């Protein structure tokens, strides 16, 4: 979860809303097993 700790503070003449993007990835020890065909299509 992502919580607001404090208010979002900006000096004058600045856009008031930002946008955050996220990036997922797997670490080194990630492993897979037992091949199966998928439903995506």
């Amino acid at each position: 979860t992502i919580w607001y700790q404090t208010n979002f503070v900006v000096p004058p003449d600045t856009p008031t809303e930002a946008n955050i993007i996220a990036l997922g990835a797997a670490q080194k020890n990630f492993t897979l097993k037992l091949c199966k065909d998928t439903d995506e299509i």
Partner: protein, 48 residues
């Protein structure tokens, strides 16, 4: 994601994951976000 797709091709997986954030706002802006993670056996927190 990518790992999201090619984990649809395997029944079982395992291992740690990594999640990275960027901030697009203007150079002047300032603030604090509290990013909190909950272990899998519990409901999401009520308040910070």
């Amino acid at each position: 994601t990518m790992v999201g797709q090619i984990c649809r091709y395997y029944t079982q997986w395992s291992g740690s994951l990594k999640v990275t954030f960027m901030f697009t706002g203007s150079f002047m802006a300032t603030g604090k976000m509290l990013i909190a993670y909950t272990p899998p056996g519990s409901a999401q927190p009520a308040t910070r």
